[PDB]
CSV table of N, CA, C and O in Angstrom, one decimal:
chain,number,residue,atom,x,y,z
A,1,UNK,N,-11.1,-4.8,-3.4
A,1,UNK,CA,-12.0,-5.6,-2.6
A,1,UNK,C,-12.8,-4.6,-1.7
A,1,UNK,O,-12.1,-3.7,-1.2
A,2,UNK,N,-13.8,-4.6,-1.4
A,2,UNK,CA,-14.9,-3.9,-0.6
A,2,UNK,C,-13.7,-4.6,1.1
A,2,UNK,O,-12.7,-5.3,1.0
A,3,UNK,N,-14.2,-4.1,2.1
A,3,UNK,CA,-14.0,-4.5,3.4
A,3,UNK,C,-13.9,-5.3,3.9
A,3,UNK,O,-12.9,-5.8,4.6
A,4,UNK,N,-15.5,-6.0,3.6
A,4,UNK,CA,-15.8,-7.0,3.9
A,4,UNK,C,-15.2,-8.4,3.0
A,4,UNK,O,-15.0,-9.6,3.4
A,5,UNK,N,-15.0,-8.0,2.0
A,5,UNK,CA,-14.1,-9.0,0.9
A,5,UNK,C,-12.9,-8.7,2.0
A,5,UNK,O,-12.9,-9.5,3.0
A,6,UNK,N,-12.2,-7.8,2.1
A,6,UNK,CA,-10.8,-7.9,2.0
A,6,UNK,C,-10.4,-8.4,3.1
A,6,UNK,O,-9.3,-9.0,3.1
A,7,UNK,N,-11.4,-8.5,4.7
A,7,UNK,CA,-11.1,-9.2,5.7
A,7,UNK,C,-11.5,-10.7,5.6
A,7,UNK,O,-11.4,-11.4,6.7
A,8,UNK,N,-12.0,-11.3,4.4
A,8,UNK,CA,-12.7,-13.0,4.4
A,8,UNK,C,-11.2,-13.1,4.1
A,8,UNK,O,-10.4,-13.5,5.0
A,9,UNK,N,-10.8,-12.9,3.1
A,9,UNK,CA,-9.5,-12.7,2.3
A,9,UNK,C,-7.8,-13.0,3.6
A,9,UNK,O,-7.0,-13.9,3.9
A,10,UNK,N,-8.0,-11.7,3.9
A,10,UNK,CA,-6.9,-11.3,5.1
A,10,UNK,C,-6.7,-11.8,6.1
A,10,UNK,O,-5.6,-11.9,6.7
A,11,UNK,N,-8.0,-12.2,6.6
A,11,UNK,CA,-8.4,-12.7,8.0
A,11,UNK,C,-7.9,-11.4,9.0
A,11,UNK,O,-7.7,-11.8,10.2
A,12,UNK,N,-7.8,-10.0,8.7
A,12,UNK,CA,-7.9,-8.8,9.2
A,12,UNK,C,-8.3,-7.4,8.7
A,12,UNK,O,-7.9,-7.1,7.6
A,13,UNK,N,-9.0,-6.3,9.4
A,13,UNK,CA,-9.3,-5.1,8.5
A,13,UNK,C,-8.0,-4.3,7.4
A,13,UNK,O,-6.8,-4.5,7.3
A,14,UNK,N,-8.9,-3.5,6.8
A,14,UNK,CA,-8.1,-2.7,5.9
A,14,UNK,C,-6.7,-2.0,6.5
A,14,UNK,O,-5.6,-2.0,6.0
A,15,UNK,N,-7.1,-1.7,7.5
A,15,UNK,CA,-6.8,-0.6,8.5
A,15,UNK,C,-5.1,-1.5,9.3
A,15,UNK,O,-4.0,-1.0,9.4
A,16,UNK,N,-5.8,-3.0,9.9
A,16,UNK,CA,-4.7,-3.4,10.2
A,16,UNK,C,-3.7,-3.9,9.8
A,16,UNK,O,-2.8,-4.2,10.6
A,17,UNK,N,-3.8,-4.0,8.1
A,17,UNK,CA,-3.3,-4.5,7.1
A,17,UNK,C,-2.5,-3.4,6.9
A,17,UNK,O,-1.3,-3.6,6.9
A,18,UNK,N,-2.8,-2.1,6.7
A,18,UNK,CA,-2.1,-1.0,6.1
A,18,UNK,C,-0.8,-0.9,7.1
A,18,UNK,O,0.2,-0.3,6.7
A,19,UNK,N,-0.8,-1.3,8.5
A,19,UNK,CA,-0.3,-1.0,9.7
A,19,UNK,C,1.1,-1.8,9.4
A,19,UNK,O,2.1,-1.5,10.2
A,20,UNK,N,1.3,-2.8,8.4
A,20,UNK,CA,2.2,-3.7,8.3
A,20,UNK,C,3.0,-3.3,7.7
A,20,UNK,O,2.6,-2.2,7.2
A,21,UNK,N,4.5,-3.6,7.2
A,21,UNK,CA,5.4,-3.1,7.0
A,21,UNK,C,5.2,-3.2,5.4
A,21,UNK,O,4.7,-4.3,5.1
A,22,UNK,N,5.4,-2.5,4.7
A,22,UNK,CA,5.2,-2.6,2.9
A,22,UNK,C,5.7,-3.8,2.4
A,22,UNK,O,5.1,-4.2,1.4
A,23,UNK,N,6.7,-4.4,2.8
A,23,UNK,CA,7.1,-5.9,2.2
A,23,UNK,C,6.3,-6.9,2.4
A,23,UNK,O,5.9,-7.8,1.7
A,24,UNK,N,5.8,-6.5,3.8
A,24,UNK,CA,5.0,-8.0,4.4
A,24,UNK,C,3.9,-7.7,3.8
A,24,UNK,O,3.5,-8.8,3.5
A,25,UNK,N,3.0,-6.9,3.5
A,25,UNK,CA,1.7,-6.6,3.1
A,25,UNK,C,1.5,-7.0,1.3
A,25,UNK,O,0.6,-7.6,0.7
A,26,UNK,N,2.6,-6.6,1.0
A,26,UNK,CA,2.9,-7.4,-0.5
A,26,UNK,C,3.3,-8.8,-0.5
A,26,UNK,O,2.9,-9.6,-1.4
A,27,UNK,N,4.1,-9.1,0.5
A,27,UNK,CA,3.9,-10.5,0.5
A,27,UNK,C,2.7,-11.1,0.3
A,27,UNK,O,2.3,-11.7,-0.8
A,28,UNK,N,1.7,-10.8,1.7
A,28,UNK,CA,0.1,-11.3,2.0
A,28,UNK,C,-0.6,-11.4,0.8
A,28,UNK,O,-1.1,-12.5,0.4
A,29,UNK,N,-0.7,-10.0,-0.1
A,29,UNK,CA,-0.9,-10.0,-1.7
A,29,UNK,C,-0.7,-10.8,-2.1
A,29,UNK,O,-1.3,-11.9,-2.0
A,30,UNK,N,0.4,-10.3,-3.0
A,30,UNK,CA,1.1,-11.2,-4.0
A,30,UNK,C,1.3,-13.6,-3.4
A,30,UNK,O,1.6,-14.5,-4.2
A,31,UNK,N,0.9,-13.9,-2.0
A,31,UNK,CA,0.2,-15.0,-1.2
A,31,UNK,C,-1.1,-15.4,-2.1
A,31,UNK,O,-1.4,-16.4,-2.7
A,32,UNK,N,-1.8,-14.0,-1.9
A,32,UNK,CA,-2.9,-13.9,-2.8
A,32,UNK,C,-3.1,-14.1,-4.1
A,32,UNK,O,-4.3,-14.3,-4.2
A,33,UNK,N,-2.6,-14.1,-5.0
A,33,UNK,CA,-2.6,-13.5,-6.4
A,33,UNK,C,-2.7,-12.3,-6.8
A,33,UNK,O,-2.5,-11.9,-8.0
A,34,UNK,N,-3.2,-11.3,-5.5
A,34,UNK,CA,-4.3,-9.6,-5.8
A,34,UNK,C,-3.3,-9.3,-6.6
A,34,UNK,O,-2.4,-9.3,-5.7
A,35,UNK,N,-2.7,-9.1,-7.6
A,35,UNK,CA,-2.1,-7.7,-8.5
A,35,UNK,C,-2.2,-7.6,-9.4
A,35,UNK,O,-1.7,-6.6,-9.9
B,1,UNK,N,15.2,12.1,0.1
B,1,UNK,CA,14.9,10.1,0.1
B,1,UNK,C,15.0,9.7,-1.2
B,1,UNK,O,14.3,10.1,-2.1
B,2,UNK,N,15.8,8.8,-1.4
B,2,UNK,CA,16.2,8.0,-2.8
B,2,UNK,C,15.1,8.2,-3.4
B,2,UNK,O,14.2,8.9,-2.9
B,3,UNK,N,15.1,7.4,-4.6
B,3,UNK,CA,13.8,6.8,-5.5
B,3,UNK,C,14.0,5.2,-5.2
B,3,UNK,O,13.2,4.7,-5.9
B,4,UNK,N,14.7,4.4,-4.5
B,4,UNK,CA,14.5,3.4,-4.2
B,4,UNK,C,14.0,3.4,-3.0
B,4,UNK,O,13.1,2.6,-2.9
B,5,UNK,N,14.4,4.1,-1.9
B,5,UNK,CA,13.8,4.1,-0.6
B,5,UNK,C,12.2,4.9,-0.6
B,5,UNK,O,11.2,4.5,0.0
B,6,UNK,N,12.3,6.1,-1.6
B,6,UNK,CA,10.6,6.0,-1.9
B,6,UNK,C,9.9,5.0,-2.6
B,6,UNK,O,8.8,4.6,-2.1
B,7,UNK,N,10.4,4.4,-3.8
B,7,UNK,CA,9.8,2.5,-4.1
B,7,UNK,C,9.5,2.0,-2.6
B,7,UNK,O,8.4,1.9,-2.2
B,8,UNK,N,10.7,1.8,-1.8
B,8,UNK,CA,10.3,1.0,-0.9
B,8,UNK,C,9.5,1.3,0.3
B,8,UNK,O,9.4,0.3,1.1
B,9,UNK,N,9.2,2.0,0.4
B,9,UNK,CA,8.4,2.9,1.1
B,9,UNK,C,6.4,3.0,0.9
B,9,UNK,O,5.5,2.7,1.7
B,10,UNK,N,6.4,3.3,-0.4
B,10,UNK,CA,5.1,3.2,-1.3
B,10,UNK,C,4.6,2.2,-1.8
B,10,UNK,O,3.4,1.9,-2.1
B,11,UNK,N,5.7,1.5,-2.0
B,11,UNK,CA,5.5,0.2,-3.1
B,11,UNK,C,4.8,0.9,-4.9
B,11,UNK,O,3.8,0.5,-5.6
B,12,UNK,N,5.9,2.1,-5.1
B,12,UNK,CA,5.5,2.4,-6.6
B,12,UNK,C,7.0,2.8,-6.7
B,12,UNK,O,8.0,2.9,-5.9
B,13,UNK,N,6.9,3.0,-7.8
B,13,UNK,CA,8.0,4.7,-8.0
B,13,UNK,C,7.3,5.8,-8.2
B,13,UNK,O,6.1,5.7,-8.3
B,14,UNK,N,8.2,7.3,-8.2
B,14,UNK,CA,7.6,8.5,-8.4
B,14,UNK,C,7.0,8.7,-9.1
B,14,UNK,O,6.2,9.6,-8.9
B,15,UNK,N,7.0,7.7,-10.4
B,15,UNK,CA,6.8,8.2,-11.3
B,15,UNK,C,5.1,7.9,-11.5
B,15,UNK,O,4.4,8.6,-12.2
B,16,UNK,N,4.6,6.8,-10.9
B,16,UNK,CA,3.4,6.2,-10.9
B,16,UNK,C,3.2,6.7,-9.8
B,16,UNK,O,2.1,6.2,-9.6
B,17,UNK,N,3.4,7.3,-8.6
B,17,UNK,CA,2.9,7.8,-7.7
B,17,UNK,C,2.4,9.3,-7.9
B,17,UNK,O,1.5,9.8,-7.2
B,18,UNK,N,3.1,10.0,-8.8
B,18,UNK,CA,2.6,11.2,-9.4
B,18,UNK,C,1.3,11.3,-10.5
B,18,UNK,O,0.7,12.3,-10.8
B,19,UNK,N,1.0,9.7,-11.0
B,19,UNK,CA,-0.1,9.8,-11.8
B,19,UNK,C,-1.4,9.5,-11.2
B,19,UNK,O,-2.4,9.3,-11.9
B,20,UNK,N,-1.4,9.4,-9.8
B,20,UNK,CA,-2.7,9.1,-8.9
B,20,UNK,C,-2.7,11.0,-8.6
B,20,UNK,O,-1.9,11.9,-8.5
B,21,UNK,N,-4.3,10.8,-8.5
B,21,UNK,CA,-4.6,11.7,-8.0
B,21,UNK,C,-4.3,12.5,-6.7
B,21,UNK,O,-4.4,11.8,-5.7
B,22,UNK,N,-3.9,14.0,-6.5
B,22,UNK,CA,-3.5,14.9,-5.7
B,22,UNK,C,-3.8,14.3,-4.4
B,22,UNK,O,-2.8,14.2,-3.5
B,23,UNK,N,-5.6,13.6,-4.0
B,23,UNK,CA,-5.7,13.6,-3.4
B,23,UNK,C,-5.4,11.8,-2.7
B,23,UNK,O,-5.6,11.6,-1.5
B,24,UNK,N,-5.1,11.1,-3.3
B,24,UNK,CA,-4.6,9.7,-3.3
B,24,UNK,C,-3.2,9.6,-2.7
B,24,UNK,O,-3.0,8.9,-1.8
B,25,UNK,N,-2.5,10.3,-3.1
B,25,UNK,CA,-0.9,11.0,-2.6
B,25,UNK,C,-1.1,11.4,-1.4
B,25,UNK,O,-0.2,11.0,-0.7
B,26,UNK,N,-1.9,12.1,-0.9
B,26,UNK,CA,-2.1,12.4,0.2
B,26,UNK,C,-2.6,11.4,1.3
B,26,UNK,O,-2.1,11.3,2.5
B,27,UNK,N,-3.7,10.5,0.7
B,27,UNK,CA,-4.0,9.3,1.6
B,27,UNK,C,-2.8,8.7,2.2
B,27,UNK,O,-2.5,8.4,3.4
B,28,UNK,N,-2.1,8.6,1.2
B,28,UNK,CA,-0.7,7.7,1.2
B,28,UNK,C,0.2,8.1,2.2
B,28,UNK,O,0.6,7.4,3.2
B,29,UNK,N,0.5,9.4,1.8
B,29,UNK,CA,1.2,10.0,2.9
B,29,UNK,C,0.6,10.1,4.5
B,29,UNK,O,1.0,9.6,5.6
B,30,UNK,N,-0.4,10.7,4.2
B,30,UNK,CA,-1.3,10.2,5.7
B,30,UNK,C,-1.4,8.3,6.4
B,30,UNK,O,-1.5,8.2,7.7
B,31,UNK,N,-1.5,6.9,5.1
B,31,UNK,CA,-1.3,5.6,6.0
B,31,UNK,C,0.4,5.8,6.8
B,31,UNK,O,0.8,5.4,7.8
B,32,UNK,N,1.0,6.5,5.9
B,32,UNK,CA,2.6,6.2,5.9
B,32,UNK,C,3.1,7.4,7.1
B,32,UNK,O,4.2,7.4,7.7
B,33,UNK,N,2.0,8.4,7.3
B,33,UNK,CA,2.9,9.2,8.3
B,33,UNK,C,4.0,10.1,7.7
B,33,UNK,O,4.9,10.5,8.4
B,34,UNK,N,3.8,10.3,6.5
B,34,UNK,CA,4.6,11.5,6.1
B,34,UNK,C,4.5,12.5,5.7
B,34,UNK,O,5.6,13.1,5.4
């Protein structure tokens, strides 16, 4: 996703997403379908 | 560090973490602080 996709998506930047613990950010993902 | 504590860590294993590029490995290590 571009940035701008990934925060409509997240409801936060790339940046603050990476900040999250590796489980929970795959959770948010995989929440998603992204993989 | 294991290979499961590096899985859990990266969210790969070594083995797919060695087939990204030199400089991708490095991003990684740089979000993760290592």
């Amino acid at each position: 996703l571009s940035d701008e996709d990934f925060k409509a998506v997240f409801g936060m930047t790339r940046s603050a997403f990476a900040n999250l613990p590796l489980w929970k950010q795959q959770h948010l993902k995989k929440e998603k379908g992204l993989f």
